Design a protein around this nucleic acid. Structure first.
Length: 121
DNA sequence: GTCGTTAGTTGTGGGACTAAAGGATATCGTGAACCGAAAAATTAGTGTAACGGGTATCCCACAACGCTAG
């Protein structure tokens, strides 16, 4: 089992909540010097949670590939991924808090590199 | 003759009665009337939709050349 709900979803939502916090707090910040200085604090969260998500996705994909190679698993199958894509599409939280295209593409390129053939179903 | 003493009753009261298993019971009699308490049920009142830039994230597709001449 690679990844925890707290280290992926909860920290991602914490970064999002901090960004909303700064967005709310920027309305009454220093004013009269333009919009850019007001949104300066927002500018910090440029690619914060994107970087965090990318790093955790890299770690998780690396652990999956390492486990598959260490047990000589020459064919890695994603179970019920089509149905989960279908339910995620007709939702809001699942799409905007569970990067599955990024995970799938990292797994695909890191398994086509190691010879493992990836199946989706 | 009379009063305290001692021993032997005599009546009366308090305390015992293996170990092992199990272990169901039924339980009357009726006087009135008003006030207070709190617990419960019924009733009366307020409602959005898209929009400007600008920017955070998602899925989804594609690229990431090779050769010739001045």
């Amino acid at each position: 089992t690679i990844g925890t709900k707290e280290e992926f979803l909860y920290r991602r939502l914490a970064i999002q909540a901090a960004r909303r916090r700064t967005q709310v707090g920027a309305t009454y910040s220093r004013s009269g010097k333009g919009k850019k200085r007001k949104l300066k604090a927002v500018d910090k969260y440029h690619k914060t949670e994107s970087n965090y998500v990318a790093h955790r996705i890299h770690v998780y994909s690396r652990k999956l590939i390492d486990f598959c190679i260490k047990h000589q698993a020459g064919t890695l199958i994603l179970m019920n991924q089509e149905d989960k894509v279908g339910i995620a599409k007709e939702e809001e939280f699942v799409l905007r808090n569970w990067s599955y295209y990024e995970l799938m593409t990292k797994i695909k390129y890191k398994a086509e590199k190691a010879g493992i053939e990836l199946i989706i179903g």
